[PDB]
From Swiss-Prot:
Disruption phenotype: Loss of susceptibility to contact-dependent growth inhibition (CDI); inhibiting cells still contact the target. This is Multidrug efflux pump subunit AcrB. The chain holds residues 499 to 547 of 1049 of the full protein. AcrA-AcrB-AcrZ-TolC is a drug efflux protein complex with broad substrate specificity that uses the proton motive force to export substrates. (Microbial infection) Involved in contact-dependent growth inhibition (CDI), acts downstream of BamA, the receptor for CDI. Its role in CDI is independent of the AcrA-AcrB-TolC efflux pump complex. The gene is acrB. Belongs to the resistance-nodulation-cell division (RND) (TC 2.A.6) family. Homotrimer, with large domains that extend into the periplasm, interacts with AcrA and TolC. AcrA may be required to stably link this protein and TolC. Interacts with AcrZ. Part of the AcrA-AcrB-AcrZ-TolC efflux pump. Induction: Positively regulated by MarA, Rob and SoxS transcriptional regulators (at protein level). Residues 1-40 are cytoplasmic. It is found in: Cell inner membrane. It comes from the Bacteria.
Length: 49
């Protein structure tokens, strides 16, 4: 059973750090995709390449 909203960010040493930096990474990646979504056809040219 996992508590609602528990991402294990604040517990122990390595696993906690890993989860923090991971959610951080995924967030940066949502901003990344949400950033490239603004441009519909540069990565398309790259794709055809």
């Amino acid at each position: 059973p996992i508590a609602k909203g528990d991402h294990g960010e604040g517990k122990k040493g390595f696993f906690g750090w890993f989860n923090r930096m991971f959610e951080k990474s995924t967030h940066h990646y949502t901003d990344s995709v949400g950033g490239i979504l603004r441009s519909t056809g540069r990565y398309l040219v790259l794709y055809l390449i």
